[PDB]
Amino acid sequence: AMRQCAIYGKGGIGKSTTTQNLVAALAEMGKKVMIVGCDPKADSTRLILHSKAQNTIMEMAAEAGTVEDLELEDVLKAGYGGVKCVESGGPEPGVGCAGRGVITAINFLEEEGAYEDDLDFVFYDVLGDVVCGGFAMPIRENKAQEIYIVCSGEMMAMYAANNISKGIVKYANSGSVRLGGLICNSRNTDREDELIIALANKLGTQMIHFVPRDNVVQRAEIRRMTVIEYDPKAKQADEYRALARKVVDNKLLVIPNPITMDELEELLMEFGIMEVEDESIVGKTAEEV
Amino acid sequence: AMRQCAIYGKGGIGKSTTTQNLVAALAEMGKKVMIVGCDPKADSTRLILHSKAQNTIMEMAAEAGTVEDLELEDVLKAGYGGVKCVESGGPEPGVGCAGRGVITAINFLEEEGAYEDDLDFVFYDVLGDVVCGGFAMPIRENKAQEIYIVCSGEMMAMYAANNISKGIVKYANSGSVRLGGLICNSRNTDREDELIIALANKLGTQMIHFVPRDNVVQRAEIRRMTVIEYDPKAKQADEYRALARKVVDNKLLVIPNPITMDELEELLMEFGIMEVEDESIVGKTA
Ligand code: SF4
Numbered sequence A: 001a002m003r004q005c006a007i008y009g010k011g012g013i014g015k016s017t018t019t020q021n022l023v024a025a026l027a028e029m030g031k032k033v034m035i036v037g038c039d040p041k042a043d044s045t046r047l048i049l050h051s052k053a054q055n056t057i058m059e060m061a062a063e064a065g066t067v068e069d070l071e072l073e074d075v076l077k078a079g080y081g082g083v084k085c086v087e088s089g090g091p092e093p094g095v096g097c098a099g100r101g102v103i104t105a106i107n108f109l110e111e112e113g114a115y116e117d118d119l120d121f122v123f124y125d126v127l128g129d130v131v132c133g134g135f136a137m138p139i140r141e142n143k144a145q146e147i148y149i150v151c152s153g154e155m156m157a158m159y160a161a162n163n164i165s166k167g168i169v170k171y172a173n174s175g176s177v178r179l180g181g182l183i184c185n186s187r188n189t190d191r192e193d194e195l196i197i198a199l200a201n202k203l204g205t206q207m208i209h210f211v212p213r214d215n216v217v218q219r220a221e222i223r224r225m226t227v228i229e230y231d232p233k234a235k236q237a238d239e240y241r242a243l244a245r246k247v248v249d250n251k252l253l254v255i256p257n258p259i260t261m262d263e264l265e266e267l268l269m270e271f272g273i274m275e276v277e278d279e280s281i282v283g284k285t286a287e288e289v
Numbered sequence B: 001a002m003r004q005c006a007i008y009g010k011g012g013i014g015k016s017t018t019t020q021n022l023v024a025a026l027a028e029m030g031k032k033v034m035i036v037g038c039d040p041k042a043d044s045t046r047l048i049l050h051s052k053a054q055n056t057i058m059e060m061a062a063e064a065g066t067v068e069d070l071e072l073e074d075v076l077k078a079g080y081g082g083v084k085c086v087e088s089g090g091p092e093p094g095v096g097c098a099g100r101g102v103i104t105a106i107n108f109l110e111e112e113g114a115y116e117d118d119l120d121f122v123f124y125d126v127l128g129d130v131v132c133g134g135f136a137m138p139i140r141e142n143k144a145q146e147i148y149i150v151c152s153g154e155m156m157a158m159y160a161a162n163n164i165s166k167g168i169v170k171y172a173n174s175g176s177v178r179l180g181g182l183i184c185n186s187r188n189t190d191r192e193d194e195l196i197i198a199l200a201n202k203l204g205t206q207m208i209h210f211v212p213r214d215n216v217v218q219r220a221e222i223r224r225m226t227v228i229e230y231d232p233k234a235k236q237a238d239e240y241r242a243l244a245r246k247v248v249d250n251k252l253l254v255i256p257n258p259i260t261m262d263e264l265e266e267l268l269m270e271f272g273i274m275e276v277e278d279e280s281i282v283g284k285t286a
Helices: A015-028 A100-111 A155-171 A192-203 A216-222 A237-248 A261-270 B015-028 B057-061 B101-111 B155-170 B192-203 B215-221 B235-249 B261-270
Strands: A003-009 A033-037 A084-087 A121-127 A146-151 A178-185 A207-211 B003-009 B033-037 B084-087 B121-127 B146-151 B178-185 B207-211
Touching: A003 A015, A003 A155, A003 A178, A015 A033, A015 A121, A015 A146, A015 A178, A015 A216, A015 A237, A033 A100, A146 A155, A155 A178, A155 A192, A155 A261, A178 A192, A192 A207, A192 A261, A207 A237, B003 B015, B003 B155, B003 B178, B015 B033, B015 B121, B015 B146, B015 B178, B015 B215, B015 B235, B033 B101, B057 B101, B084 B101, B146 B155, B155 B178, B155 B192, B155 B261, B178 B192, B178 B235, B192 B207, B192 B261, B207 B235, B215 B235
Parallel strands: A003 A121, A003 A146, A033 A084, A033 A121, A146 A178, A178 A207, B003 B121, B003 B146, B033 B084, B033 B121, B146 B178, B178 B207
Antiparallel strands: none
């Protein structure tokens, strides 16, 4: 039926551009999609709308002052490929939980049954810098069944992926939340792909795709658009089509096996990212040794 | 008497390293300091203690049933310069507020009288990727009055400073929590110091110090130590000493003026970070 997915990832590594280019490729495939951005900043839909920034629910839930009031023309703007783009926004720093913007928006959308109105895929675009009750909501309430984690060969990105996995673990029984795989957004780090493949193996999942750096992304980004609509004949455009088809045809939805800090640091060390500590010189000043 | 401070800032920009290096310089300087780490990850004290990972109040609380049994000598360890250290810890990922461990830590350190046993400064090392719940707690409950924000010449690091600054405004009349300045953790970017001086001035504050990048930092860190303890003669040791002195003499404690995204983007464009929006080029790439 309609598939509900979520792309989780640490911020600062192009996750949203990947989510958006991913959904664009899906749209070109003739798939009906909707993006629910769950990022406070709200950049999960600009590339699809060619906008500077989309209006969030929170912002215009402070205009009419009451949670439910905004047919979808002011709140749910459809853009490229028929992809419906929505933004949750977040509350003011210090005003209740920041996941209030998320928890709000779904109910509101389930109230307009936007989920039932001709849809094949829904992708919540969520940040994983903090995996707390607020941001794990889509998972917790069983709102997102297929999770895909965007990460890079870096400590925090991999730490964030492990924590998202822990949160998937926690709810794998109460509902049907499952990890579809890891998406590595290359940051031009050596053995990055092999590091993520390794992490995929350890977590007991798969690195469903390696997204390369290709300046046509930054190029199309400036255009406030995806690499797909920009130049569908770009070599990078094919990487999204590939990822997209693996997502569509993904049978592998697992319950992850998180690793310990040692295992992670272990991984990071054998791939040349983290320095191996020399036990002897620990706590010795530069003059002593 | 004791000054309760907190270093706020987004993750991944070298904040905990800057905090421990500043605290070591303070201790080298003769000051009696306590660091209360508040990052669920718990990495705010290892350089002071030359440790693998300090056991967090949360990990322990989960052991002897609850936080009532916990002993203070098991929670608070002292290291270089006599600096005392504690790690709040945090709940398991996805279960409740990620930053709640602070409430548990503060309440315990309170009952145990930790704050009256010879302390000149307390520094909560708090994350600021989001400013809500347990993260905003030291501000909300008036637990730290002097806030210093670590940031760099990057969009997200700047955005977090602004939201943290927003959090301070919100609790203005709530207590005496004020912003004491921005600390720039250089990322070896062009005109980075200028960029932060620009934002601090826009905020109604000061860039209290620009921390340069320097390999001596990693050389000290690989040994689980601060630059002050590892190489006191280093140029970088003086930088942390300068910061320490200015923080100690700081008198500028204000209620910040949160800028807008457009202003943010203005500083970034203006300083060689973001590019000016071309326009014929938008909407219909080719
Ligand atoms: S649960 Fe998360 S979103 Fe909510 S207040 Fe806590 S840290 Fe913030």
